[PDB]
Amino acid sequence: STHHYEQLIEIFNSCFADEFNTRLIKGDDEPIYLPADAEVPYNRIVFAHGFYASAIHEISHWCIAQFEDVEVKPQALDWLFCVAAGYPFNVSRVVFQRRVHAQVMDYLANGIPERPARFIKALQNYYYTPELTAEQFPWPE
Ligand SMILES: [Co+2]
């Protein structure tokens, strides 16, 4: 499959534009969260640059809502999303990515929270990818 940020906009909106009144928007240099208002009546997650990886990262952060500690769970969702989509994962070293790996394992063993779980299933149906298995997430070596 190809991977274009425009695809993530449609997948995200399909998952969340109704239930959570939230949509994904390609922005400029800044990631932003803009709540619905009287003119634009839906919440907007704005990601920086027309870059697939950047959209994934803002989606992960939205799902979760000392920099290492705060970044572990969003980067774990990043990794899950990328494998679900058939996209290559990188962080943005080995010690930190092992913390992310453990958190992916935690999620897979103990349960993925509702919003990322929904996004993962939609990714799988959009890109026709097999069910996730821990084996698709190699320990950082
Ligand atoms: Co981040």
PDB file of N, CA and C and ligand atoms in Angstrom, residues 57-58 61 70-71 74-75 78 92, ligand 1:
ATOM      1  N   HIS A  57       2.060  10.948  14.768  1.00  0.00           N
ATOM      2  CA  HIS A  57       2.495  11.390  16.099  1.00  0.00           C
ATOM      3  C   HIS A  57       1.447  12.262  16.801  1.00  0.00           C
ATOM      4  N   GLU A  58       0.804  13.167  16.068  1.00  0.00           N
ATOM      5  CA  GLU A  58      -0.213  14.005  16.709  1.00  0.00           C
ATOM      6  C   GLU A  58      -1.431  13.189  17.095  1.00  0.00           C
ATOM      7  N   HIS A  61      -0.626  11.479  20.336  1.00  0.00           N
ATOM      8  CA  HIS A  61      -0.680  12.417  21.453  1.00  0.00           C
ATOM      9  C   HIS A  61      -2.119  12.722  21.835  1.00  0.00           C
ATOM     10  N   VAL A  70       7.125  11.263  29.513  1.00  0.00           N
ATOM     11  CA  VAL A  70       5.894  11.722  28.872  1.00  0.00           C
ATOM     12  C   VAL A  70       5.751  11.201  27.437  1.00  0.00           C
ATOM     13  N   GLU A  71       6.872  10.906  26.786  1.00  0.00           N
ATOM     14  CA  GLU A  71       6.839  10.474  25.395  1.00  0.00           C
ATOM     15  C   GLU A  71       6.721   8.961  25.200  1.00  0.00           C
ATOM     16  N   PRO A  74       2.855   7.815  24.029  1.00  0.00           N
ATOM     17  CA  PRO A  74       2.575   8.247  22.647  1.00  0.00           C
ATOM     18  C   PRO A  74       3.446   7.556  21.609  1.00  0.00           C
ATOM     19  N   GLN A  75       4.715   7.309  21.922  1.00  0.00           N
ATOM     20  CA  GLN A  75       5.575   6.656  20.940  1.00  0.00           C
ATOM     21  C   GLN A  75       5.243   5.169  20.790  1.00  0.00           C
ATOM     22  N   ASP A  78       2.420   5.279  18.469  1.00  0.00           N
ATOM     23  CA  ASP A  78       3.041   5.518  17.162  1.00  0.00           C
ATOM     24  C   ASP A  78       3.433   4.213  16.509  1.00  0.00           C
ATOM     25  N   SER A  92      10.960   9.854  17.321  1.00  0.00           N
ATOM     26  CA  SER A  92      11.215  11.300  17.267  1.00  0.00           C
ATOM     27  C   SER A  92       9.952  12.028  17.713  1.00  0.00           C
TER      28      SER A  92
HETATM   29 CO    CO B   1       5.589  13.708  21.107  1.00  0.00          CO
END
